[PDB]
Design a protein around this nucleic acid. Sequence first.
RNA 1: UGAGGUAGUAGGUUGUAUAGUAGUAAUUACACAUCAUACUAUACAACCUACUACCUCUCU
Lengths: 253, 1664
Amino acid sequence: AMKTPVSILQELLSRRGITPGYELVQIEGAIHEPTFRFRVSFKDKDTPFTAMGAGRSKKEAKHAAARALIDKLINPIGWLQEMCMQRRWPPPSYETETEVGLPHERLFTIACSILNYREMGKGKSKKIAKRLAAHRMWMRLQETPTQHSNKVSQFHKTLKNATGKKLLKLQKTCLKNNKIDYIKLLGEIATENQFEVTYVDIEEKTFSGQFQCLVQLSTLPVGVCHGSGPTAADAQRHAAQNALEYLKIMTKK
Amino acid sequence: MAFHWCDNNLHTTVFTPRDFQVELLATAYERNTIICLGHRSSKEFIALKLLQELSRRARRHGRVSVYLSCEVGTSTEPCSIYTMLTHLTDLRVWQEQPDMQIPFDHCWTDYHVSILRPEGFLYLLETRELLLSRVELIVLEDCHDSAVYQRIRPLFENHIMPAPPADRPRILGLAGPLHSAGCELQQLSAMLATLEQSVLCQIESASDIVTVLRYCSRPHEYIVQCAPFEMDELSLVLADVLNTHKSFLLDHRYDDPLNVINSLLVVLHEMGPWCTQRAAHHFYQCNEKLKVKTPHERHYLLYCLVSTALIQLYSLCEHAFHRHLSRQTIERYSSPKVRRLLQTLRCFKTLCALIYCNQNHTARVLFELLAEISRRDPDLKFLRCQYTTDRVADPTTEPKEAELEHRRQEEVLKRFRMHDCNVLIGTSVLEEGIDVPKCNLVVRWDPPTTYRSYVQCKGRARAAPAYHVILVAPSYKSPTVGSVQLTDRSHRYICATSLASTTKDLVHQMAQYREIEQMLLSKCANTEPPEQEQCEAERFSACLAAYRPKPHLLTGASVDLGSAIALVNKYCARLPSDTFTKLTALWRCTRNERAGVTLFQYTLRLPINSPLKHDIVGLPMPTQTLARRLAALQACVELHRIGELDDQLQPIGKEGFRALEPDWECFELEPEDEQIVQLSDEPRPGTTKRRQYYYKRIASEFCDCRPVAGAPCYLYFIQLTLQCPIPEEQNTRGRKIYPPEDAQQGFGILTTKRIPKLSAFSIFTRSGEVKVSLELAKERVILTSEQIVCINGFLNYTFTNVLRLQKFLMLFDPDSTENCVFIVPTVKAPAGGKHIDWQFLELIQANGNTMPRAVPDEERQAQPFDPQRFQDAVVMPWYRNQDQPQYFYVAEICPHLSPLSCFPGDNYRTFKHYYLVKYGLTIQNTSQPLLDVDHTSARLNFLTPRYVNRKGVALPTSSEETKRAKRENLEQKQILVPELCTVHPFPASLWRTAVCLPCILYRINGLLLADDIRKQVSADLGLGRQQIFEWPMLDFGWEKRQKQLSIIQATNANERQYQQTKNLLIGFNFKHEYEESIAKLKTEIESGGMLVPHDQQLVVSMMELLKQLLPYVNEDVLAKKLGDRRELLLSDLVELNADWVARHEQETYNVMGCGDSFDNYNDHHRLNLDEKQLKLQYERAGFSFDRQPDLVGHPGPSPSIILQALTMSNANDGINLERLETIGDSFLKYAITTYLYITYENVHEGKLSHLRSKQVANLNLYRLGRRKRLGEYMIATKFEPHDNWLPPCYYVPKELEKALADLLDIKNLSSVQICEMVDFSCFIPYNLVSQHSIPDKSIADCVEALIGAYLIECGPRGALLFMAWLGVRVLPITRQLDGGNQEQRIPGSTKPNAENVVTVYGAWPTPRSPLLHFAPNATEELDQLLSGFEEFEESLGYKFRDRSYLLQAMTHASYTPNRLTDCYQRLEFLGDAVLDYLITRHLYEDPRQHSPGALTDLRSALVNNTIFASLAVRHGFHKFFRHLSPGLNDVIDRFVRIQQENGHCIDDAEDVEVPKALGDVFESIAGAIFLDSNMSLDVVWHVYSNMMSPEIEQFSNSVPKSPIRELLELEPETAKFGKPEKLADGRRVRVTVDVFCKGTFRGIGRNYRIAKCTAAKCALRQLK
RNA sequence: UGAGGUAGUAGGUUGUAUAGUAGUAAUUACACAUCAUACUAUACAACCUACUACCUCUCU
Ligand SMILES: [Ca+2]
Ligand SMILES: [Ca+2]
Ligand SMILES: [Ca+2]
Ligand SMILES: [Ca+2]
Ligand SMILES: [Ca+2]
Ligand SMILES: [Ca+2]
Ligand SMILES: [Ca+2]
Ligand SMILES: [Ca+2]
Ligand SMILES: [Ca+2]
Ligand SMILES: [Ca+2]
């Protein structure tokens, strides 16, 4: 059944006497592979048949010669590995998956897996199993292989748009007079624009012997406006005055 | 490509200056100088070289050096210079210990450099055991600051001043910059003079500062006063806000913001509100990280309040010109200093601008302003700007942002280097270090507050119309008033909306800087001609008919007076150099008076590697520019005369050079080869990609050879003798062995012409190993007409019926022309010997093609079994295979079996059955024995054994099961029935020898083709013998202190430069131990148009010349000499001077150069050095390598070794060419190199490489062997005697194969008449039986392999003569004319060809030693320039007998004191070939029998410039390699520092640089030991085996590999090395390799090669 | 040592790619960019060959 045609022709002759003889016509060592061309003959007594055949292997050529006589009587591959070298990878590892228990007709199945996909190949020998698996895996991989200050200005513009009328009142009122309550109006802006104000008067005294306060805007940035005075309360009022200056110079457009 | 610009090329008027360091040591060599260099490493280089030169002067009548050093005597750590002096010189140096007290017995006169501290030498000179008249150099380590000055004052004012100047040594004083000594300047001119009065020198300050001062395009100085910066409303509000916050933060309490305050106020007051917001950018980006990065909550409050202050400023500016409302917008808000920078860039409209700053935010905001305005304005489209900062991060902490900073410096300075950006707005890092293009503008932004900042950054503008523009603005005055709130104008804004003092002080500052550089040029000696001298000579440059090579043609070349100097510079800058060599023309000016005018003669000097070894004494002119131009014109005429400058007058180059001897030029060939060469699309000749078909040449002992009747023919016996029985492990069937030497019937050759002697080769049979020979039958055999017919029938029987060798297409032709020898069956005689078996020949005639008779049962019943009819028989059966029979041997006649003994299987009963069932036969005698038979041989290639493969490894045999198991199981035997078999007339023993026949005939033909080659070359060139002793037989061959020390060495080596970069500070002052010039220069600056104001926008007949230029020649003589010619030939100037020199006394010239610059160091011969006055004349056994057998009478090689050379590796044979082919490749390259050194005695070796590479290429060796048709003698195929073999006396039509009683006309008449008488297509050319395809490279391989064969038998002379036969003429010819009868026939001596001459090939002469006698005492200067290399000679064990080879090998191309030889480059070229051959020949002869790959990789590990430099340093080079290169001294310094760490053993990784010049001098010492020894290879190998034999033996037992190959193959498709990228420094480069999914690893080095090597070492020790 | 098939294993050739070692420069300031100048390796592959182990049809 699955005998090779050289053995098939040998079987058809050995039942009728006669042993064939193979003679190599021509081998050709070209640029990338050599070709082999055999001639098979058939007796010297009664109808001396003959044929010739060729292939890229000696056994393939002998097989093709015998197959032609039966009909008468009726390369890199590692382009895959170069491509693996191109896309920054370790080399592939095809692995011997399984085999058939019969010794002379075992058809191997060999799988090649890498970090992306998995493929496999079945062959009459394990070498052609690797060729079919590597062709399928090559097919699989070749089918589907300051600005911070501007940001602060932007969301402070948004909180300005969420503030309300006290920004325009702040613009249209001179802050030189202390008759407008700085701390109270900053708290009004806090209640108005969903935030809170913070006042820090640190306990020590300066070289000038004065008091100072830092007002912190409890919003997204860190936020400090400074102020000082001879007393603690005047220092906190001047700090809220500088906070009003901050919101004022932010407001005008 | 992208760069492709002028880069100034090379200088045209000043001779392209040498680098300053060797000029300083030139001046120091003859003057007591004071070298003013800020760099400690430069001072250390000059001191090292100067102690070396004056040490060479010292140890001749006995002197000593001293190095008084203030940083000595505290720690016992050796100093800065003790390292360099003890590991880079051969001297013995003695830095004294802290409180040193004379270790044991310590006589001071046995010390050469003697490092001390200043008070130590006061001690040691008052000790009076180191006398001052013995000291030859006194290097004051510092004498430019007051402390050590007061300490060294007792030395001078006690000992040096009370000493006559005939005893005072050189007083090289290593001062720092006199141009950085910081004492205003009003007393500067005093103190150095005071210094010169007190250390007894005079300053010869010639630095990198001064070399730009003299020999460069002086840029145009434009110190622009900008304007006062007035304030508008917005800037006043901003100043109010930051002053308010500054005065507050003075009082804010925490019981670095002043950095932001003290930076942003200056930005506001010097650039304006726009750059104030774009520096609020930089400082708020600093705060946005440094407010989070702090752990203190109140410091967090402080940094964030400063951040909100910067927010306030940025919002104020953003609400001011985008919101209140753009080149008028930026010009409105910029300060005027920005405006003048804009006008300076607008006017200079091409550019390479180099703006400078001193703070990083300043540079960043200048970048932002130029980016904005360049993307706005029409004028500055061409400004694409890129900035710089300094190194604000540290390699200890935050290495991610520090590395990102380093990559930003790398990526900015790479794209400034070509032309991608023209503008580099840098900071203080750009002054030194970083390399930039030639510049045509440096706009310095601040005033340069230091002189050095002024000069090292003005001295970067070198694109000849270059500019230097300094901006001047009023300095910072704080408008701060106190802790007040916002002002009335500030509140109104937010609700509604002194040049003269600064300019005068910079004028005084720049007048001081001008006086500094005027004092610097005052201190420099080599004064240079002013600009008006160039203008005068330019006017004078037409009265001279220029020198013409082809004066008939007005298109051809011409050398005028400007092109004279430009051509001398172009010639010397095309002379060959390495990376560290500066090759320049030296020049010595002069003056003397000549009957009136004083005239300025020059003397010239070209580099040492130039072939022009003379002093080109130039001709005088009134102005020294004009006589400089004429001296270079005299040089260019002499250059074209001597043949450097060819007939087009541009130096020649490699490509245009042509081989001089006419045999070396030919390179001619059969015209199909040059057709393929001109085609350039087929596989080109000489390669392995082109297959050409040739003819399997049947030997000339086998053509026209058949006997005809009566012709006496010789009878050879094909003797077979078994030398090695089969091992019983391979004996998987247990058969008896059969020796063939006791077999009765064997064979014989029978031939009309004698086969000569051949190598008794061996075959490998089923029965073991047999030795095949041939032996003659003495009685020559006469054949009758009848016996020829029976031998014809027999030979058709033996090679057609028995062995089945005859193909289809071939015929038996009994009367055949070629391949026509007889084979006859020989029988042993009873008494002794053999003869032809005539009875068996008659039997073969009778038993013809007898198809075996199917015996009927009558004879089977009638006659019984016979033992003698089957013992030693061949027992083919007749019931099956009736027409193509199958032949079995007989192992045993087995008696225990029978036809009734049991069948081994189970489908039948015993052996008398199943002959009835399967066949129909009946066994009659059922009481007969049976036949243990094994098949006859059917793979007749018995040339290779089957149980031992090629490397001596023995392949696996057949276990113990498949032996004495199934050996004796009756299933796995062939047992035949003797009445069912016919005994073939050929017995079994005759079948043994008969089946061995085809490979016997093949190997005899192969050894005959090899003997044909031998007799061929012995016919042509006397090389061998023609006929004859037996040839040799044909045989096949078978922790922590390590890193601590490394860190110490690398750190202190870099700490010299770290001490330089911690010394941008102030120098000398005097504690008691001009103004007119300043006012003049102030008037010059305000009046000469240098100072732009604050409003001006920035911007004669030929007879007269003959009278002037020749004032020493009057109205007479000149009138006759000029004649009616329009312009004088140069010979007229030469002739008129020759007349005046003839008339008068001896002239006494005047050496000039203000003294010693470019004199007394280079080219001086006749001088009184005291008063500097010239008196010149204008007019001049255990494996020897060189063992040679007695080649006269030699039989040439053996045909086994020639056969080995002819055998390709496609043969799959035993023998093979490859080891010969590598050894012959290396010997060919060696011998060609040595003859090119002998022959082209002046040619630069990059053209010797061109000529050798033409001789040694694959095209040349293919083409020569194809001229000798070597493709038709080669063995290139696996010998299958059924597929590619022609049996004796058969014939093949040779054309009827492919073009498809009638077949016997093909040889008789024609072929095309026979043709027309009746997987990848189908057509194949080429004939298997009598042709074989060979690649052209395989022909070249057989060429080199045959040189290998002739080499290994008949010596180097024989291999030279074989390449003389083959065509590579590499020997000289001394022709006689029939000088004898060609009976004596010395080898080389060819035919009496055409007219009766011989053409003998001569040996190699001793070449003339390269001691140039262009100076009058070159032997005494050779004795004096090699004082003390005797310890070096002991360090390699061979005394040079002509020491100019040794000096030549040690002389770098920059060692300009050498006037006696060339450089080493030619010896490096020769010694590489010598070393390559010696190593390849050594690894050939190791009995491990290395492969091609093993020998190549073990050579590449043994021969490697890194191994070469390591063995150079280890075995004591580099202390004698005489160079004067600074950078190479640095590289040698660091490399020997590391190699004394290792005890002489072999972010970014940074391996220490391997000095390539040390590998080159490792090679050049081999070349010089070769040449110096009458060209011997066992004087080179003795020395270099004694050096590298530890390395040979260590790398023999393992494999080192290069780090690059070892990484790239240990991760074979994974270790990928990438493209190099250049660093910020511009002389370093970085290579990264990604071992994929395992990491990127990075290395640095100067070049791409050491950078990949370092990266490979990084990943190698990483993955371990 | 019938013929075939499969597995190793040991040789070699050729292709393709990545290289290396030596030499060599001139473009280029000088280098990188080299290199139908010489030799070879590794990875993949094609082929030829040798042996062994298992088999199947023979053959006995
Ligand atoms: Ca055999
Ligand atoms: Ca066979
Ligand atoms: Ca001289
Ligand atoms: Ca070669
Ligand atoms: Ca070769
Ligand atoms: Ca070299
Ligand atoms: Ca088989
Ligand atoms: Ca080349
Ligand atoms: Ca190459
Ligand atoms: Ca090449």
